[PDB]
RNA sequence: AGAUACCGUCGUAGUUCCGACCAUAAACGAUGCCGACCGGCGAUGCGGCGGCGUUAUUCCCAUGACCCGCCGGGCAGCUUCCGGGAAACCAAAGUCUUUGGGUUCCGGGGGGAGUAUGGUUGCAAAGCUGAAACUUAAAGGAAUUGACGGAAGGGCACCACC
RNA sequence: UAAAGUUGCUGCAGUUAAAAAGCUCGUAGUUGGAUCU
């Protein structure tokens, strides 16, 4: 996996966790 | 293709290196002398070495052959190089000398020589080739 | 190459160097006595002057500042000291 | 590992160089990294010179030329064979080919 | 070279470069030992004497063997002063 | 380079002490997380009760059943 | 010269050097050849100090003389300009000539046919004769060279500062070297000019060969 | 029978060179192993340090050669190291023995402290390097022995060093570089300029100059 | 900026001697440099040197005789007792047969053997061998 | 085959400017700053100094444009057995087991992971700081020989073509 | 604990193997030119 795409995936994961964790 | 291989060329080279005087002027003499003093198994091969012997000897009449180290070739070269005229090329009455080399001579205790002549210096300093 | 040695002269290799990089540093400048043809007295001017100096008895521009050595006016006879 | 000492560009002593678009693909390439060709072309091709010269209303018109500067990215310059890969030792030679 | 009892304990005493005073190694195959012939004072002929100069491979490599041999010959009377 | 001053002892000692934590073995020994995670808790041996016999497959290049026990 | 009136420069030698243009260097100056030049001309040509040239020639002659077996000195010329001169020098002084291509491994490959082990090496030009120069650094072989202003002095132990581009200059330089070696050995004498004259050492074009007969 | 090919070989065969030290003094290349066989051939002991197979991939499979590292030397101040690669192990070892004989260098030995008796250790600290392997030799007191890894220990014992401290840095697992680095450190013993070697050198006629006419008549 | 003019002088001498030069220029000169150079010269390691006096800070032209392997400085100037001298000698000198450690002691600037003779310690300036 | 892409026609935010925020890039010379020392050469940019000669100011000097050098910083280049390095390569990435000129930041097998968590900053996106359990014998660097390339350039056989 | 110069004060590294802050300024800290018998 391209490193920048893995970074984008981790960013999306963090955003989803921030949304779910209210 | 009529390129002669290293077998023919090298055997002819050794023969002319070794039996340079024993050679002849006609190809048919050359094959006979080659067959006299060489273990050449077959007629075709001895013919080919003889033929390149003729061609190499034809090349001899005008100059040396690179792979051959015969003493007679060295004698010929050293006789040709033994040429001298009656007047040396360095024996001339007037030698044009620039002022700077004149000063060099004068500081060398040779400014009293009257064999030289003043050649004027160059007008400018345009000696470099243009860049780019 | 065998520094400070008298056997091989090097006035020419020493005044070619940078003034600070010499064996003993020394300025590349000088003071000069200047006569103006219209004037009658000496004026000691620095070679690399930065001031538009005038004759001590007149109002004539002796020299003008430049990037380096100052530019003297015509006719003024200038001679270095020492 | 480093392939070239100059990194394939002429950027020495500056930070940023303005880009230009490749004439072949419209790719942004730095002006120093772009590969530049300056073509001088007769606007009339060699075969058409005779016809136009014969049909001219003047005498000895000397036909005008066309001055086009082309800037290539590395990919388009390689595909068009303007430049090509060289051996590791022949790479260092910056001398242009004879012309 | 020596021990307390006084005898010399080295296998051999290696040469030193006549210009740099550094040991010339056993496998310094670029080093040279050149003999310059002495010449009789009045007739200018070889009198059978010579002066030897050993130059190491490093000095020859940096191109300084020529100037070093010139300096040694000048200091040895072979090359005329000035 | 590194500092070489007669009055740099605090700097050198502190830098060494901070940089020792990037040593994996030193950090494992001195952080206390590994001792907490260790089932033996710093002991060389431990007594246990066998819960079941489990067969463990050897890793891919080899092929066997390693006969283990859950305790 | 050793400050010897017998070994000092003569007027005939200086005249020959000037006629052959030995003092004329190139427009480039190798930094290790600086001590051998006099001054740069207005056209960029460096003048070679002929006193220094004579000193270095005499030092080279002394180095050549201090080898009892003359065949142990090798005289090399890859360029066509100095082949005739080298052959004449070898004939005169008994040295061993290598005129033409110097095959690599001549000093280093003891199996080779033309393998030879000289005690001294003389070359016509360090640039053209760089192969024997480099090989001399493998067998402890000292080197004498005819060096122009821009010649590199690596592996050159005795450099003779001279014009080595002109045929007249190279021939005259080899002729003077042979003359001085013979004079120092005991053969011939300084009380009379040598019978050989430099034109015999010169390289001549084949067109000139045909014309002059 | 030995038929010398070089001038040095001819001079050695005719008993004109009285010792191997005369060859080392003038730093002449030794192109004939029979010279070393003549001078030291009764006391030299060769040890095959290693046989290492090296493979070159080709159109079909790997062409394999074997490289022999061999250490040679009498135990009284002479040591050499030779590496030869060949198709067969036996000829590789033969060539490596020849090359180790050709590369034999003298070893300078000194004293750690008080100078009673024969020299026993390196004259000073000397470092040798080969391809990221650095080997440092330090003088040691008499009776210490060679404090070193087995590979440098072999070469140091073969060189007549009785006691020596050793340091090593780098990839010493590569036996060839380790051996070459310790050989370099050993050969640097005679290149180090110590104040007892300050005495001005008295030049002697080289073997080619001394026995010139002998070679001329040949 | 430059600290430790002695370090600069010693590095210059070392670099010049490694190139095989006959003289080396040192600037600026100082009393410590002159004393260190005198210690080096008394043991035959450099030779004569000339102090060029300009009215700001002198220079030194040091004649090199190629007997020097390494002249180095030890920074900082650690205080050295007579006990620590053996450990410093083992660390710095290539042999117990030759080489010197230079100290500045209250009795002057001297090598380590002379400091043992006068039974004194001090601060290590550098070493040469 | 599918295209959600490459390609085409449009086209929103944006791209432009003003005022606030963000503080990240292969933000790179993947190379901290200051100082000393250690080769050669030809250029080039700025400043100064010196000098045949050529041009313009249509006249004296000066001043420009050239030409030949020198000195000082600067961007670089070529070269070199300085030396170094695993090598690529570097006149610094040299002056290193012959190890110490001064000083700042920073690395310690590969993953987990720049993740979790806490703190802090931000309107937000996110930035700074930043683990562990666990997993693993290699991951990696440079260079060599092959093989392959939807890379380039050649050569050959009427089992290729004309 | 040594081996580990793989924690490097002695004594390690940081172009490409892990690594020099994007870049400057800047207090503390550290380090500081010659010179006085």
From Swiss-Prot, chain D:
Q: Which Gene Ontology molecular function entries are recorded, alphabetically? A: cadherin binding; mRNA binding; RNA binding; structural constituent of ribosome
The record's Gene3D superfamilies line, in alphabetical order, gives: Ribosomal protein S26e
Task: Tell me the Pfam families matching this sequence.
Answer: Ribosomal_S26e (PF01283)
Q: Which family is this protein grouped under?
A: Belongs to the eukaryotic ribosomal protein eS26 family.
Purpose of the protein: Component of the small ribosomal subunit. The ribosome is a large ribonucleoprotein complex responsible for the synthesis of proteins in the cell.
Q: Subunit notes for this chain? A: Component of the 40S small ribosomal subunit.
What this protein is called in its record is Small ribosomal subunit protein eS26
Protein source organism: Homo sapiens
Curated annotation (Swiss-Prot), chain E:
Which PROSITE patterns does this entry report, sorted A to Z?
Answer: RIBOSOMAL_S21E
Residues where N-acetylmethionine occurs? 1
Keyword Endoplasmic reticulum assigned:
yes
Modified residues annotated as N6-acetyllysine in this record: 81
In chain numbering, cross-link Glycyl lysine isopeptide (Lys-Gly) (interchain with G-Cter in SUMO2) is at: 41
Q: Which superkingdom, per the lineage?
A: Eukaryota
The GO molecular function terms of this record are: RNA binding; structural constituent of ribosome
Q: Which Pfam families match?
A: Ribosomal_S21e
InterPro entries cross-referenced by the UniProt entry:
Ribosomal_eS21, Ribosomal_eS21_CS, Ribosomal_eS21_sf
Q: Name one GO cellular component term.
A: small ribosomal subunit
User: Subcellular localization, per the record?
Assistant: Cytoplasm, Cytosol; Cytoplasm; Rough endoplasmic reticulum
Q: Which UniProt keywords apply?
A: Acetylation, Cytoplasm, Endoplasmic reticulum, Isopeptide bond, Ribonucleoprotein, Ribosomal protein, Ubl conjugation
Biological-process GO terms, alphabetical? cytoplasmic translation; endonucleolytic cleavage in ITS1 to separate SSU-rRNA from 5.8S rRNA and LSU-rRNA from tricistronic rRNA transcript (SSU-rRNA, 5.8S rRNA, LSU-rRNA); endonucleolytic cleavage to generate mature 3'-end of SSU-rRNA from (SSU-rRNA, 5.8S rRNA, LSU-rRNA); translation
Q: Which family does it belong to?
A: Belongs to the eukaryotic ribosomal protein eS21 family.
Cited function: Component of the small ribosomal subunit. The ribosome is a large ribonucleoprotein complex responsible for the synthesis of proteins in the cell.
User: Quaternary structure per UniProt?
Assistant: Component of the 40S small ribosomal subunit.
Q: What is this protein called?
A: Small ribosomal subunit protein eS21
Q: What organism is the protein native to? A: Homo sapiens (Human)
Q: Which gene encodes it?
A: RPS21
From Swiss-Prot, chain F:
Q: Where is this cross-link: Glycyl lysine isopeptide (Lys-Gly) (interchain with G-Cter in SUMO2)?
A: 36
Which superkingdom does the taxonomy of this entry point to?
Answer: Eukaryota
Location of the region described as Disordered in the Swiss-Prot/TrEMBL record: 1-25
Q: Where is the composition biased (Basic residues)?
A: 1-19
Q: Where in the cell is it found?
A: Cytoplasm, Cytosol; Cytoplasm; Rough endoplasmic reticulum; Nucleus, Nucleolus
Report the transmembrane regions from the record: none
Query: For this protein, what post-translational modification is recorded in UniProt?
Result: Hydroxylation at Pro-61 affects translation termination efficiency.
In the record, 3-hydroxyproline modifications are located at 61
At what positions is N6-succinyllysine found? 53
Disease / disorder: Brachycephaly, trichomegaly, and developmental delay: An autosomal dominant developmental disorder characterized by brachycephaly, ciliary trichomegaly, dysmorphic features of the face and hands, hearing loss, and developmental delay with short stature. Intellectual disability and autism spectrum disorder may be present in some patients.
User: Can you state the subunit structure given in the record?
Assistant: Component of the 40S small ribosomal subunit. Part of the small subunit (SSU) processome, composed of more than 70 proteins and the RNA chaperone small nucleolar RNA (snoRNA) U3.
| UniProt family annotation | Belongs to the universal ribosomal protein uS12 family.
Protein's UniProt name: Small ribosomal subunit protein uS12
Gene for this chain:
RPS23
Q: Which residues of the full protein are shown?
A: 2 to 72 of 143
UniProtKB/Swiss-Prot annotation, chain H:
Assembly and oligomerization: Component of the small ribosomal subunit. Interacts with zinc finger protein ZNF277 (via zinc-finger domains); the interaction is direct; the interaction is extra-ribosomal. Interaction with ZNF277 competes with the binding of RPS2 to protein arginine methyltransferase PRMT3.
**GO cellular component, as recorded:** cytoplasm; cytosol; cytosolic ribosome; cytosolic small ribosomal subunit; extracellular exosome; focal adhesion; membrane; nucleoplasm
Q: Native species of this protein?
A: Homo sapiens
Q: Which residues carry this modification: Phosphoserine?
A: 206
The record's comment on protein family reads: Belongs to the universal ribosomal protein uS5 family.
Q: Mind telling me what this protein is named?
A: Small ribosomal subunit protein uS5
Note whether Phosphoprotein occurs among the keywords: yes
Q: PTM Phosphothreonine: at which residues?
A: 194, 212
Record cross-link Glycyl lysine isopeptide (Lys-Gly) (interchain with G-Cter in SUMO2), residues = 217
Residues modified to N6-acetyllysine: 205, 217
- Provide one Gene Ontology biological process annotation: cytoplasmic translation
Q: Which UniProt keywords apply?
A: Acetylation, Citrullination, Cytoplasm, Isopeptide bond, Nucleus, Phosphoprotein, Repeat, Ribonucleoprotein, Ribosomal protein, Ubl conjugation
Recount the PTM note: Citrullinated by PADI4 in the Arg/Gly-rich region. Asymmetric arginine dimethylation by PRMT3 occurs at multiple sites in the Arg/Gly-rich region.
Grouped into one coarse class, the protein's main location is cytoplasm
- For the cross-link Glycyl lysine isopeptide (Lys-Gly) (interchain with G-Cter in ubiquitin), the position is 217
Superkingdom field: Eukaryota
Kindly list any coiled-coil regions of this protein.
none
- Give the sites of the cross-link named Glycyl lysine isopeptide (Lys-Gly) (interchain with G-Cter in SUMO1): 217
Q: Molecular function (GO) terms listed?
A: cadherin binding; enzyme binding; fibroblast growth factor binding; mRNA binding; RNA binding; structural constituent of ribosome
Give every S5 DRBM domain span.
44-107
The annotated consequence of residue 217 to R reads: Does not affect readthrough on the poly(A)-stall sequences
Location comes to: Cytoplasm; Nucleus, Nucleolus
């Amino acid at each position: 996996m391209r490193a920048k795409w893995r970074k984008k995936r981790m960013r999306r994961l963090k955003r989803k966790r921030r949304k779910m964790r209210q | 293709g009529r390129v002669r291989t290293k077998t023919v060329k090298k055997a002819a080279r050794v023969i002319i290196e070794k039996y340079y005087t024993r050679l002849g002027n006609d190809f048919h003499t050359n094959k006979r002398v080659c067959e006299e003093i060489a273990i050449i198994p077959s007629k075709k091969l001895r013919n080919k070495i003889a033929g390149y012997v003729t061609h190499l000897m034809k090349r001899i009449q005008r100059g040396p052959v690179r792979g051959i180290s015969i003493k007679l070739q060295e004698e010929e070269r050293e006789r040709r190089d033994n040429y001298v005229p009656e007047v040396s090329a360095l024996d001339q009455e007037i030698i044009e000398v620039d002022p700077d080399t004149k000063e060099m001579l004068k500081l060398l205790d040779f400014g009293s020589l009257s064999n030289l002549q003043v050649t004027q210096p160059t007008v400018g300093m345009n000696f470099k080739t243009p860049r780019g | 190459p065998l520094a400070k040695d008298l056997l091989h002269p090097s006035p020419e290799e020493e005044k070619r160097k940078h003034k600070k990089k010499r064996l003993v540093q020394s300025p590349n400048s000088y003071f000069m006595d200047v006569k103006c043809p219209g004037c009658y007295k000496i004026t000691t001017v620095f070679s690399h002057a930065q001031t538009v100096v005038l004759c001590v008895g007149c109002s004539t521009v002796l020299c003008q500042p430049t990037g380096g050595k100052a530019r003297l006016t015509e006719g003024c006879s200038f001679r270095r000291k020492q | 590992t480093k392939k070239r000492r100059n990194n394939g560009r002429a950027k020495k002593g500056r930070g940023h160089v303005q880009p230009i678009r490749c004439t072949n693909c419209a790719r942004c390439v730095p002006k120093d990294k772009a590969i530049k060709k300056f073509v001088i072309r007769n606007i009339v091709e060699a075969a058409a010179v005779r016809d136009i010269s014969e049909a001219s209303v003047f005498d000895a018109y000397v036909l005008p030329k066309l001055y086009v500067k082309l800037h290539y990215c590395v990919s388009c310059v390689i595909h068009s064979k303007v430049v090509r890969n060289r051996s590791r030792e022949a790479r260092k030679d910056r001398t242009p080919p004879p012309r | 070279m020596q021990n307390d009892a006084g005898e010399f304990v080295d296998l051999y005493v290696p040469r030193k470069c006549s210009a740099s005073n550094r040991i010339i190694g056993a496998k310094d195959h670029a080093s040279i030992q050149m003999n310059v012939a002495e010449v009789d004072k009045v007739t200018g002929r070889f009198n059978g004497q010579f002066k030897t100069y050993a130059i190491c491979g490093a000095i020859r490599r940096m191109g300084e063997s020529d100037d070093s041999i010139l300096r040694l010959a000048k200091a040895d009377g072979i090359v005329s002063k000035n | 380079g590194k500092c070489r001053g007669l009055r740099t002892a605090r700097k050198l000692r502190s830098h060494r002490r901070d940089q020792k934590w990037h040593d994996k073995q030193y950090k494992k020994a001195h952080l206390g997380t590994a001792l907490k995670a260790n089932p033996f808790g710093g002991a060389s041996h431990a007594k246990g009760i066998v819960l079941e016999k489990v067969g463990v497959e050897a890793k891919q290049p080899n092929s066997a059943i390693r006969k283990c026990v859950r305790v | 010269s050793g400050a010897l009136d017998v070994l000092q420069m003569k007027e005939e030698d200086v005249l020959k050097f000037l006629a052959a243009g030995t003092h004329l260097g190139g427009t480039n100056l190798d930094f290790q050849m600086e001590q051998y030049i006099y001054k740069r001309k207005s056209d960029g040509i460096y003048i070679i100090n002929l006193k220094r040239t004579w000193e270095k020639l005499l030092l080279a002659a002394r180095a050549i003389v201090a080898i009892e077996n003359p065949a142990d000195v090798s005289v090399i010329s890859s360029r066509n300009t100095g082949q005739r001169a080298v052959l004449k020098f070898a004939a005169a002084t008994g040295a061993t000539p290598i005129a033409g291509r110097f095959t690599p491994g001549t000093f280093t490959n003891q199996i080779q046919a033309a393998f030879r082990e000289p005690r001294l090496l003389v070359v016509t030009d360090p640039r053209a004769d760089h192969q024997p120069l480099t090989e001399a650094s493998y067998v402890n072989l000292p080197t004498i060279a005819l060096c122009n202003t821009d010649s590199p002095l690596r592996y050159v132990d005795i450099a003779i500062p001279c014009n080595n581009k002109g045929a007249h200059s190279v021939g005259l330089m080899w002729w003077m070297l042979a003359r001085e070696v013979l004079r120092m050995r005991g053969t011939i004498s300084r009380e009379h000019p040598w019978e050989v004259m430099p034109d015999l050492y010169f390289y001549r074009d084949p067109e000139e060969i045909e014309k002059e007969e | 029978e030995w038929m010398p090919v070089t001038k040095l070989g001819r001079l050695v065969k005719d008993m004109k060179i009285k010792s191997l030290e005369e060859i080392y003094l003038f730093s002449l290349p030794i192109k004939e192993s029979e010279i070393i066989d003549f001078f030291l051939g009764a006391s030299l002991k060769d040890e095959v340090l290693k046989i290492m197979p090296v493979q070159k991939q080709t159109r079909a499979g790997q062409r394999t050669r074997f490289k022999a590292f061999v250490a040679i030397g009498d135990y009284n101040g002479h040591v050499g190291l030779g590496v030869k690669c060949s198709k067969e192990v036996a000829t590789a070892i033969r060539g490596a023995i020849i090359l180790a004989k050709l590369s034999i260098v003298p070893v300078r030995r000194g004293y750690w402290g008080n100078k009673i008796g024969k020299p026993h250790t390196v004259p000073c600290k000397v470092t040798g390097r080969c391809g990221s392997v650095l080997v440092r030799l330090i003088p040691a007191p008499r009776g210490t022995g060679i404090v070193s890894a087995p590979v440098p220990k072999k070469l140091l014992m073969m060189a007549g060093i009785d006691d020596c401290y050793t340091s090593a840095r780098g990839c010493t697992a590569t036996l060839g570089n380790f051996a070459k680095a310790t050989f370099d450190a050993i050969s640097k013993t005679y290149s180090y300029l110590t104040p007892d070697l300050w005495k001005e050198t008295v030049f002697t006629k080289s073997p080619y100059q001394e026995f010139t006419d002998h070679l001329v008549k040949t | 900026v430059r600290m430790n003019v002695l370090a600069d002088a010693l590095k210059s001498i070392n670099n010049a001697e490694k190139r095989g030069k006959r003289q080396v220029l040192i600037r600026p000169c100082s009393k410590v440099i002159v004393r260190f150079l005198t210690v080096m010269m008394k043991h035959g390691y450099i030779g004569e040197f000339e102090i060029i006096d300009d009215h700001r800070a002198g220079k030194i032209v040091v004649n090199l005789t190629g007997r020097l392997n390494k002249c180095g400085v030890i920074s900082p100037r650690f205080d050295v007792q007579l006990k620590d001298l053996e450990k410093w000698q083992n660390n710095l000198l290539p042999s117990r047969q030759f080489g010197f450690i230079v100290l500045t002691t209250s009795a002057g600037i001297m090598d380590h053997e002379e400091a043992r003779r006068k039974h004194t310690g001090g601060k290590i300036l550098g070493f040469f061998f």
